């Protein structure tokens, strides 16, 4: 089988930054070798086929070069809706291999979360569980600290958090911490509030509600 | 346009068997050599093989050619996955290709096989109530295996849309929340409608989400 190798496996750029990405064959493959592009949670998608065409709808910043055993993907100016994976793959011998990928990320400037809290609904509490929800929307870096108090306290457990990928449109993450409690200790308390922490805050930001209101 | 759907994934026990299917539209599947491509959570993609149109040529990787068989139905333009006794190393997205040009020009959106000794769970779903810029949401909680899939009042409502990574509970099931953020004038006027589907439980839930 022919060993495809990529480099860099991984890079961060500027909108507006010339891209090149290499892929070696283990052997020479003549001008059989393809491109693909996947984009966080979508399906591969092909961009170039035979080292250099590009296939129907696809960008034109995007090009291929190379012959043999070394070829070369350019993305002549980067753009938001490039932040994705690219494959390179030959088509020359049996059984048909990949590159191992190119993680391409987006460097941007500083950008503050718009932060959003959401108490349990009226249907949850009914089989006898409460979910409070934190939202962390669009910043930028990744880096971001959320801490949860209860009548002041600060709670020392039942939370977890999750985190998107580089939104395509303005290279933002968003965040969301769930403290999940029984509607008994729920019962218990009245103020719930989420304290955010990151580089876009000059102070940490507070969201909060009385439960019942 | 050429459409590729696959079917028939979800859960399968350590050494089962499952057969996948990818119904397809918009072309002469009779005339077009069909293939099979595979990619592990947070890994690269992975060649299966490939059939041409009379099915008298079948390729496969060397390394997968005991734990799939690859057919075809030309009057159905339906392509074949047969996976025997699995392992957990094949916990992975299948991806039926259309071999052109060769390249792999059109793709399905994939079907995830989970291999686990664990038992299916349908999740509950509950609303995340807004209260210039507004966000609400749903909560879908308590599912095995994955993925579930949330949209927007059919599919009509896509910007501002922040669907998260399921998260493994203590308990051992997937639990995920969606968000949108619209405008906070819309609230008492604009209808929203969360679109959950988990189809290894085949649950299909419409929650409508007001303030």
């Known amino acids: 089988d022919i060993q495809m190798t990529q480099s860099p496996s991984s890079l961060s750029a500027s909108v507006g930054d010339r891209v090149t990405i290499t892929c070696r064959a283990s052997?020479?493959?003549?001008?059989?070798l393809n491109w693909y592009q996947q984009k966080p949670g979508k399906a591969p998608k092909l961009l170039i086929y035979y080292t250099s065409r590009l296939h129907s709808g696809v960008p034109s910043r995007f090009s291929g070069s190379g012959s043999g055993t070394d070829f070369t993907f350019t993305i002549s100016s980067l753009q938001p809706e490039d932040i994705a994976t690219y494959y390179c793959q030959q088509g020359s011998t049996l059984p048909f291999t990949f590159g191992q990928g190119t993680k391409l990320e987006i460097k941007r400037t500083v950008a503050a979360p718009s932060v959003f809290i959401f108490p349990p609904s009226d249907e949850q509490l009914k089989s006898g569980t409460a979910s409070v929800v934190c939202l962390l929307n669009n910043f930028y870096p990744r880096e971001a600290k959320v801490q949860w108090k209860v009548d002041n306290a600060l709670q020392s457990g039942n939370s977890q958090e999750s985190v998107t990928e580089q939104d395509s449109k303005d290279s933002t993450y968003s965040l969301s911490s769930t403290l999940t409690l029984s509607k008994a200790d729920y019962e218990k308390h009245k103020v719930y509030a989420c304290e955010v922490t990151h580089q876009g805050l000059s102070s940490p930001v507070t969201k909060s509600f009385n439960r019942g209101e | 346009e050429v459409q590729l759907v696959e079917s028939g994934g979800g859960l399968v026990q350590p050494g089962g068997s499952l057969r996948l299917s990818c119904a397809t539209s918009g072309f002469d599947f009779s005339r077009y050599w069909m293939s099979w491509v595979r990619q592990a959570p947070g890994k690269g993609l992975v060649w299966i093989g490939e059939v041409n149109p009379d099915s008298t040529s079948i390729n496969y990787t060397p390394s997968l050619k005991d734990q799939f068989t690859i057919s075809r139905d030309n009057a159905k333009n339906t392509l074949y996955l047969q996976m025997n006794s699995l392992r957990a190393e094949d916990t992975a997205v299948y991806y039926c290709?259309?071999?052109?040009?060769?390249?792999?020009?059109?793709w399905g959106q994939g079907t995830l096989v989970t291999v686990s000794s664990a038992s299916t769970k349908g999740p509950s779903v509950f609303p995340l109530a807004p209260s210039g810029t507004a966000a609400l949401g749903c909560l879908v909680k308590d599912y095995f295996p994955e993925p579930v899939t949330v949209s927007w009042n059919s599919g009509a409502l896509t910007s501002g849309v922040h669907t998260f990574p399921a998260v493994l509970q203590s308990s051992g099931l997937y639990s995920l929340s969606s968000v949108v953020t619209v405008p906070s004038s819309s609230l008492g006027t604009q209808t929203y409608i969360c679109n959950v589907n988990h189809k290894p439980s085949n649950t299909k839930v419409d929650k409508r989400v007001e303030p």
């Open positions: 052997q020479d493959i003549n001008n059989y």
């Open positions: 290709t259309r071999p052109n040009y060769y390249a792999m020009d059109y």
